[PDB]
Design an enzyme around this catalytic site. Sequence first.
Site, PDB file in Angstrom:
ATOM      1  N   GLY A 222     -50.218 -14.389  51.313  1.00 33.62           N
ATOM      2  CA  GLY A 222     -50.835 -13.996  50.036  1.00 33.62           C
ATOM      3  C   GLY A 222     -50.861 -15.143  49.121  1.00 33.62           C
ATOM      4  CE  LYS A 223     -51.361 -13.306  42.569  1.00 31.89           C
ATOM      5  NZ  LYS A 223     -52.328 -12.787  41.540  1.00 31.89           N
TER       6      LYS A 223
ATOM      7  CG  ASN B 254     -46.461 -17.092  54.173  1.00 33.69           C
ATOM      8  OD1 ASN B 254     -47.264 -16.705  54.768  1.00 33.69           O
ATOM      9  ND2 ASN B 254     -45.942 -18.187  54.080  1.00 33.69           N
ATOM     10  CB  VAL B 255     -45.777 -10.722  52.045  1.00 34.84           C
ATOM     11  CG1 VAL B 255     -45.072  -9.158  51.943  1.00 34.84           C
ATOM     12  CG2 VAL B 255     -46.738 -10.930  51.125  1.00 34.84           C
TER      13      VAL B 255
ATOM     14  CG  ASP C  81     -57.882  -8.963  40.977  1.00 35.29           C
ATOM     15  OD1 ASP C  81     -59.126  -9.309  41.384  1.00 35.29           O
ATOM     16  OD2 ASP C  81     -57.056  -9.232  41.567  1.00 35.29           O
TER      17      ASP C  81
HETATM   18  C1  F8Z Z   1     -48.423 -16.616  39.335  1.00 32.38           C
HETATM   19  O1  F8Z Z   1     -48.549 -15.300  39.075  1.00 32.38           O
HETATM   20  C2  F8Z Z   1     -48.105 -14.247  39.851  1.00 32.38           C
HETATM   21  C3  F8Z Z   1     -48.726 -12.877  39.263  1.00 32.38           C
HETATM   22  C4  F8Z Z   1     -48.487 -12.058  40.327  1.00 32.38           C
HETATM   23  C5  F8Z Z   1     -47.951 -12.025  41.451  1.00 32.38           C
HETATM   24  N1  F8Z Z   1     -47.536 -10.862  42.300  1.00 32.38           N
HETATM   25  C6  F8Z Z   1     -48.013 -10.663  43.561  1.00 32.38           C
HETATM   26  O2  F8Z Z   1     -48.305 -11.787  44.337  1.00 32.38           O
HETATM   27  N2  F8Z Z   1     -48.271  -9.440  44.101  1.00 32.38           N
HETATM   28  C7  F8Z Z   1     -48.528  -9.116  45.423  1.00 32.38           C
HETATM   29  C8  F8Z Z   1     -47.956  -8.206  46.194  1.00 32.38           C
HETATM   30  C9  F8Z Z   1     -48.751  -7.758  47.201  1.00 32.38           C
HETATM   31  C10 F8Z Z   1     -49.695  -8.628  47.991  1.00 32.38           C
HETATM   32  C11 F8Z Z   1     -50.065  -9.750  47.280  1.00 32.38           C
HETATM   33  C12 F8Z Z   1     -49.695 -10.109  45.940  1.00 32.38           C
HETATM   34  C13 F8Z Z   1     -51.211 -10.688  47.626  1.00 32.38           C
HETATM   35  O3  F8Z Z   1     -50.971 -11.819  47.527  1.00 32.38           O
HETATM   36  N3  F8Z Z   1     -52.442 -10.301  48.076  1.00 32.38           N
HETATM   37  C14 F8Z Z   1     -53.727 -11.050  48.062  1.00 32.38           C
HETATM   38  C15 F8Z Z   1     -54.077 -11.255  49.645  1.00 32.38           C
HETATM   39  C16 F8Z Z   1     -54.749 -11.205  47.127  1.00 32.38           C
HETATM   40  O4  F8Z Z   1     -54.328 -11.637  46.005  1.00 32.38           O
HETATM   41  C17 F8Z Z   1     -52.794  -8.944  48.083  1.00 32.38           C
HETATM   42  C18 F8Z Z   1     -52.634  -8.324  49.266  1.00 32.38           C
HETATM   43  C19 F8Z Z   1     -52.645  -6.805  49.231  1.00 32.38           C
HETATM   44  C20 F8Z Z   1     -51.106  -8.885  50.032  1.00 32.38           C
HETATM   45  C21 F8Z Z   1     -51.076  -8.472  51.657  1.00 32.38           C
HETATM   46  N4  F8Z Z   1     -49.833  -9.053  52.060  1.00 32.38           N
HETATM   47  C22 F8Z Z   1     -50.131 -10.643  52.391  1.00 32.38           C
HETATM   48  C23 F8Z Z   1     -49.476  -8.380  53.110  1.00 32.38           C
HETATM   49  C24 F8Z Z   1     -48.552  -7.178  52.743  1.00 32.38           C
HETATM   50  C25 F8Z Z   1     -48.317  -6.349  53.822  1.00 32.38           C
HETATM   51  C26 F8Z Z   1     -47.475  -5.080  53.465  1.00 32.38           C
HETATM   52  C27 F8Z Z   1     -47.070  -5.154  52.203  1.00 32.38           C
HETATM   53  C28 F8Z Z   1     -47.217  -6.096  51.177  1.00 32.38           C
HETATM   54  C29 F8Z Z   1     -47.920  -7.127  51.585  1.00 32.38           C
HETATM   55  O5  F8Z Z   1     -46.400  -5.629  50.068  1.00 32.38           O
HETATM   56  C30 F8Z Z   1     -45.830  -4.486  50.547  1.00 32.38           C
HETATM   57  O6  F8Z Z   1     -46.001  -4.214  51.750  1.00 32.38           O
HETATM   58  O7  F8Z Z   1     -50.133  -8.249  49.194  1.00 32.38           O
HETATM   59  C31 F8Z Z   1     -47.442 -13.209  41.868  1.00 32.38           C
HETATM   60  C32 F8Z Z   1     -47.675 -14.292  41.085  1.00 32.38           C
END
Ligand code: F8Z
Lengths: 66, 272
Positions: free
Chosen positions: B21-22, B25-26, B135
Amino acid sequence: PRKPIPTWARGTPLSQAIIHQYYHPPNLLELFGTILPLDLEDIFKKSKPRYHKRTSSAVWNSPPLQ
Amino acid sequence: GANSRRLTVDDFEIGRPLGKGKFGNVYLARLKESHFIVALKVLFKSQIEKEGLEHQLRREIEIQAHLQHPNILRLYNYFHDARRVYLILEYAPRGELYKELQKSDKLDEQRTATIIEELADALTYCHDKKVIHRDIKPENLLLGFRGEVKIADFGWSVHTPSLRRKTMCGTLDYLPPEMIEGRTYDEKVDLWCIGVLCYELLVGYPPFESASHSETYRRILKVDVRFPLSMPLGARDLISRLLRYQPLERLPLAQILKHPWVQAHSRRVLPP
Ligand SMILES: COc1ccc(NC(=O)Nc2ccc3c(c2)C(=O)N([C@@H](C)CO)C[C@H](C)[C@H](CN(C)Cc2ccc4c(c2)OCO4)O3)cc1
């Protein structure tokens, strides 16, 4: 966080744990506590103006939930 | 106080990666003692610092401390070490909606109408708490255990007691006209984005998509929406009521929830 995938983290074990958690949500305050206010200075080990200067964004009139 | 808790990496066991993700990694993880399952998102501080988006991380965490909703991905808490900030997140067992769109191209009416109802409900709650999301788009949407949608990320969002801001936010295809014009806007930017999302979910591409940036701007500003032959009337109607140049003309959330097409097709489920 790169480890071999353990048995709890896949297949029926994961599904059944997810099911249990879904229908038996715990007390989240007791589990995780209060979300502590962010100290950007502390986190990034830097002083920047944006860290201290807030807009109305900072003024909450509704309660913290947890 | 009594609920000020110590959270560190040693409280968690890592299960598996969930994806990039941004800013990091998750991972699927669980609390070692309680075995409560979470998603742990690992944010690299240097990446955030370089981009100068520290204030967005603050916004996420402050919003998360004041809002909870069954269709908003919950941040249980956060912590940090020298190099990383860790978000302890609600785990979304059915994963990224945008992966389930790679499968089919578009979603059926039932699935779309369900997501639309959930989001109008979630955004009603956000707007009542003076939060504009800014968003709403498929890449921000996760799926719960029974497919209930979860808005993932508040990084572009802001709490605004006056419900009036000016920051340009979100992705190109989802920009409302007033953002392209650089004008002050209110919470009704979210209404626009629901319209765009509804179109993309049903059609498989967003309504103002163009090879070029300027052309996209031009199609947005003109509200050049043309519905493919595949789209049912009810959805064309709903989308047409949301994608209005004038913010005050956009169909309110309360009326999205009441819209006959939403009512007809939504099969929403709620967790306990
Ligand atoms: C610097 O300022 C910030 C501000 C907010 C954040 N918050 C943040 O990153 N929240 C977040 C939570 C889940 C996310 C993402 C982002 C993210 O980084 N996304 C991208 C691809 C677009 O911005 C949104 C996706 C939905 C991403 C999916 N991930 C990579 C897989 C995933 C799979 C299953 C999950 C899960 C995440 O969280 C719960 O269960 O899941 C971080 C830094």
